[PDB]
Amino acid sequence: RTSIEQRSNAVSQVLLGIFSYVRWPKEPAVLQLCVVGPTEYADGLLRGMVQANGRRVHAERRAVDNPDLGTLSNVIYLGVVDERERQQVFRSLAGHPVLSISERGTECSVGSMFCLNVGGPRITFEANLDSIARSGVRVHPSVLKLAR
Template identity: 55%
Template sequence: MNVAAPISGRVTNLTRSLLGALLLLFGAQACAEAQATSNLAEQRAKAVTQVVLGILSYARWPVEPVQLRLCLIGPTEYADDLVKGTTQATGRPVQVRRLLADDPRIASECDAIYIGKLSQDERSRLFTALSGHPVLSMSEADDPCTVGSLFCLRVSDRQVAFDVNLDSVARSGVRIHPSVLQLSRRRAAQP
């Protein structure tokens, strides 16, 4: 019985050491995967910011705002970089804030809105409230771009592209330079 005790103790210590090494290995692998996912999400957010700023630079309002007011509506997946605030290439600052979809200030205090995930009912009420107000709208969440939004982002691992709803553009009161419409067609043609 005395002989078995030291062997059992050595096996237990060896088992613990192996388990500890495996946990460290899997932990390091999980951290590396989390870091890669975080980097990819950060890259997507930066790419979305560039596309959003590009779209905004091609827009003209009936009365040009000195400071562009961009409102984020609903939960967003790619707007983290936008939230930090930014400046357009022209030097015009972009003030970014989050508002709820039913906030009555959207139509009067937002020059542009970036829409995340909303229910159909919320989207309908939002676009009803925006009717007659010059507000540029962009959607990020699986939007077929058939109702409401002027621009619908399509985010993938390789690029951020967008669709344009010409009917919504015509009704928005915001003028969009034709170059952005051509850019949309060109990106749609890319694989």
């Protein structure tokens, strides 16, 4: 199987890792993951995931302009969006306990809590401490030991 498929599977594994360091105010029986925007590496997420603790992660695509993104998702996995679309998305996320992760992220200072860098021999990611604090979920500090 190809490198894109290889990297897609690793993206799955990395996200499950990140998830285990996150807590929701009220924990759902099924973790809702929404994939939003064009993505290269979200095909493994979209097949479904299950946490170590047994909880099912349900994932589906949703539109960038879906006004209910914040209430529909516990996790958002954010693909390519222009500036106005990005702003649009996070206005919907505001005030809801949503873990946000972007597939690309050279800057990772505006928007998502975490930004993957899928290129190179291994996946790495950056953390946005500000986003992390305004996000609504509790991020265990150990996860920062897993960032680049």
